């Protein structure tokens, strides 16, 4: 595609520049080009890929929620009819969001996941697969159940690997649990599962902190505080 003539290293260099300039659409396009070179990604490169698309899809999701709220209010008793424009524009934003999710899922399927053998990369990519199916689920209204189950299945494979191959304080394991817990709470209508997962994850990490350096301790406790914040919110 458009990045096919640029060196892999130049794409990564430009992705880092785009991040500094808060140009996340550019950043995502550069990292897509880097993935399409066909080589596996390093730890730093995987995080550039995720940062880029998380920011792009984050803005789209926030816009979709604003528009969906306006649309719902327009269907309340006593709302003046304003025509098709709200629905049309919500659909436009929805379609662009789905396209981004499809692009990320396509990169994971061709061929990031199948080449990823180490626990750190495989779990990272399967968490991403679960995350982007979850974003598809947020806007889904015949295929909603299958979209939900695709998210669940990706998260579950990642959980299984992370519990076997990673310590309980591993930041990827913790963030995977954080997100799968939110999936349970607000996608799968399973708040009790969400709370159980967050509390167990928190407690098992707490008990492993003593093994860590100062820097690793800061990394793990940062994510543990996100789990605690969610538990406080939900209980």
């Amino acid at each position: 595609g458009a990045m096919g003539s640029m060196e892999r290293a130049s794409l990564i260099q430009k992705a880092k520049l785009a991040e500094q300039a808060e140009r996340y659409e550019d950043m995502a396009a550069f990292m897509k080009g880097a993935v399409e070179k066909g080589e596996e990604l390093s730890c730093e490169e995987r995080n550039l890929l995720s940062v880029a698309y998380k920011n792009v899809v984050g803005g789209q999701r926030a816009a979709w929620r604003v528009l969906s709220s306006i649309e719902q209010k327009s269907n309340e008793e006593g709302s003046e009819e304003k025509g098709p424009e709200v629905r049309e524009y919500r659909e436009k934003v929805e379609t662009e969001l789905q396209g981004v999710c499809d692009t990320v899922l396509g990169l994971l399927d061709s061929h990031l996941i199948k080449e990823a053998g180490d626990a750190e990369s495989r779990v990272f990519y399967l968490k991403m697969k679960g995350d982007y199916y979850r974003y598809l689920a947020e806007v889904a209204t015949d295929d909603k159940k299958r979209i939900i189950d695709s998210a669940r299945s990706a998260y579950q494979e990642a959980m299984d690997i992370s519990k076997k191959e990673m310590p309980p304080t591993n930041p990827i394991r913790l963030g995977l649990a954080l997100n799968f817990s939110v999936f349970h709470y607000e996608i799968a209508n399973s708040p009790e599962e969400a709370i159980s997962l967050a509390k167990t994850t928190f407690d098992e990490a707490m008990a492993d902190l003593h093994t860590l350096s100062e820097d690793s301790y800061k990394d793990s406790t940062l994510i543990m505080q996100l789990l605690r914040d969610n538990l406080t919110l939900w209980t």
Partner: peptide, 6 residues
Amino acid sequence: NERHTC
């Protein structure tokens, strides 16, 4: 306050 994902 909104729940966290990362």
